[model samples]
Target: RHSSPQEAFERAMEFYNQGKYDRAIEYFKAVFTYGRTHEWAADAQFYLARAYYQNKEYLLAASEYERFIQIYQIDPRVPQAEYERAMCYYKLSPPYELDQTDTRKAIEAFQLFIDRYPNHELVDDATQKIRELRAKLARKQYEAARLYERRELYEAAAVTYEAVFDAYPDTPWADDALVGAMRAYIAYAEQSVRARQPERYRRAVELYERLLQIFPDSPLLRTAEELYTRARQRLTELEGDASLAQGQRQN
Candidate 1:
């Protein structure tokens, strides 16, 4: 309704400041559409996306910000738009237990932003978000391994737990994964028949020793020690049995 592009842009800002996103959207659209070639159009487009964001229309806001980034590569606000576009996807991400399609999208978007603007003010924040999302992904894998453990599927649990660390070694869940691998192998050995137990227990010993070597000061040290003692006892017994077998054959 404003007579000129600058006037329309000014009205849009007033509405945005007042939290009247609907009115802001209308005015900003006027600047974007009627003032397409005007100097303020890029800013107008950026604010149009901001209006949708303020209105809590996150999906629409993400789309609008993407459009702004594509149309105004030279605009100073372009970088901000790219960052906010990623945030829109971040807002759409569900809890770690649910589907992570949007979470993954947010990571990709943030990664692209960081690569493009390494020195941007929000780079640290974006990097932190990427770590948090990766942790969520690691948690999901940890949970999957836990599910196998709950079902008493120690072999599958060991493999999955192994993946938990191998795939996401940087995550906090990696610590738990290492512990879980040791426990899973121990459980498998405990359930094995006597003949196979020697070998199975040997495998568990490797995992237990690995945990100690890598994380000797882990908070789970007491638990690891307790578990390790049991394996040592079984190994000693197996060695004794083998010695007796060899003596009998010599006789």
Candidate 2:
């Protein structure tokens, strides 16, 4: 009971310097709980968050950093707190095949930090990180479409590929998405009933035409041309079938 809050904070700092983050957290929480309005309050709160971060407990670290940011409005450490909090979420981001909620949160957090602190030294780094996370999301979507195609769900694959292209046109996968969509639609048309083949083939041809405009120098240009020709040939054949039926009915 004789030990003051200042003594607790000093002990926390010693523990932190000694790499005993668990002990540091206990004392820092003491400082935060007993004397939050003291002159050392902000440092205590920040060090508490750092203690969690040092332990690689990013979820707790992020929460503590958020608490620091919310409670200490004008503290000089607030900007660093904002960036590190985003990084906690970034570190929590899972692989491309898993849920990307944390990945998206990391992107949003980094973007907010960039917008709020335009001249901060970390702004460029945050921008780069945002791009990295966005590309990861794009990769996830692209892979999902590819899986659909591999499973022979051509219609679903075709639409998902279009979604990928639309959502991330600036990503490296956008060109591939265009090609994949065209291929999927072609397969989908081939599997349709005779009467439905023409319309689906028409969509495939339209996709090929769009690919030409969107990625004129795409390395897959040859493949796109082949698919276009296939679609066109099928359409002509379907038209011939319709005409033969019409002439037979008239006769």
Candidate 3:
């Protein structure tokens, strides 16, 4: 006793409205077995994806939404499907301490939607989600740099901190990353060979100047000032010693 496609679709809608996503998924998939040649096929496809999404099966939902986009490109709901697909990946992204592959994918998906539909009403929401995802990535890099610093790998720490500052300049962690870089470079210089100390110290001084210019009101101001003073005094001492050596050589 097989029901018609219309009957299956109607039952699916009833189950979906009643918040029984499991039964809705079954009925919607049944609608598909009748094939997509009918007018209700598009609605069935869209609602099937929604059912999976409501069931918290985000990966399946993303695939179904993508299927709808590819097969029913002319549907008026395509834009909503596109946004929901990006959101599915967003929901799957883990915390900052975990691998960020899904986070990056979500960002890319949102960017694509924004580019494809500049006038879409969801553009602002997509842009905000992208910003939040980027902040999480920046935090991961920032934490790694701090770990390197704690392990006394000053050179690597300094470089990684600089990377965070450069890659995510607008993130809340950027100022702290610059400060970390300055401190790491100074520590690296102090333990380096005499020939390497001057260059490393110069990098510390340069980073301090950048921090002062770019993040003037940062709460790390006192620490930056202290690091800057130490870096400048050491660099001047090194320059004086070099000039004295030059005078001796001339004599």
Candidate 4:
């Protein structure tokens, strides 16, 4: 027994209000499918996506929302659908330690929406979400570098730490990366061949100096000062005992 277009939507809403989102999805889809020419069809497609989301089927909901955007590209509600679809991907994003493919996807979608609708009301919200997601990625990158450091791969570790700092300068992880890299940088020089060790030590000293200027209130102050002094001591005798050369390097 096929109902009228309005009757079908009325039934869908009744199911939705009753918290029977599975049944609601069926009727909502029916409203658009059997009544494609009806006044409510476009929005019915939108409601179909909402029903899937309300049913906790976010994967289906995200795709359905995308379907609506494709089917009704001229619909006035496209921005809302785009935003909702972005949120669906966000909802599927897992915990901090988990893979963040979905999180990245959500960021991309939200960014697209913001690019297209710069003055939209959801712009600030999308920006906030993107910031949060980037922070997570920064932390993950920091942890990966730390893993290299723990494995005593000092050269690779130093590069990774510096990479994180360079790539994510605005994140709190940047400070940690720069700080951690200094120690690993020195260690790499210490493990180098005796001839290259002094030059590497010199580079480490420069890194520590740079970090000191950047992080005045850094907690690694005493450690950094001690390491810098040691690096200077090691450089004094290198390059054919070129105290003058070392002095110029320091100068």
TM-score of each: 0.79, 0.83, 0.89, 0.80
Clashing pairs in 4: none
Regions more than 4 Å wrong, model 2: 206-218, 221-223, 232-251
lDDT of 2 by residue, 80-177 (tens): 99999999999999888899999999989998999899999999899888878878888888898899999999999998888877887767788888
Q: Estimate candidate 1's alpha-carbon lDDT, on a 0 to 1 scale.
A: 0.84
lDDT of 1 by residue, 1-251 (tens): 78889999999999999999999999988886674788888888898999999898899999999998888788888888999998888888888899999989999999999999999999999988888887888888899889999999998998898887777777888868887877887898788766666766676677777677777777887877777778778877877785434333222
Candidate 3: minimum summed lDDT over ten consecutive residues — where?
242-251
* RMSD versus native structure for model 2: 4.3
lDDT of 3 by residue, 1-251 (tens): 23788999999999999999999999999998889999899999999999999999999999999999999998989999999999999999999999999999999999999999999999999999999998999999999999999999999999999988898887889999998998999999999866667788889889987888888899997868898889889978887784444333222
How many clashes does the backbone of model 1 have? 0
Give the number of colliding residue pairs in candidate 4: 0
Best candidate per TM-score, number? 3
Candidate 2's error at 227, in angstroms? 3.0
TM-score of 3: 0.89
Better candidate number, 1 or 3, judged by TM-score: 3
Task: Give the candidate number with the greatest lDDT.
Answer: 3
Q: Order the candidate numbers by lDDT, best to worst.
A: 3, 2, 1, 4
Better of 2 and 3 by TM-score: 3
After superposing candidate 3, which stretches have Cα over 4 Å from the reference?
212-217, 243-251
lDDT score at residue 94, model 1, on the 0-100 scale: 86
* Candidate 1 residue runs with Cα over 4 Å from true position: 192-217, 228-251
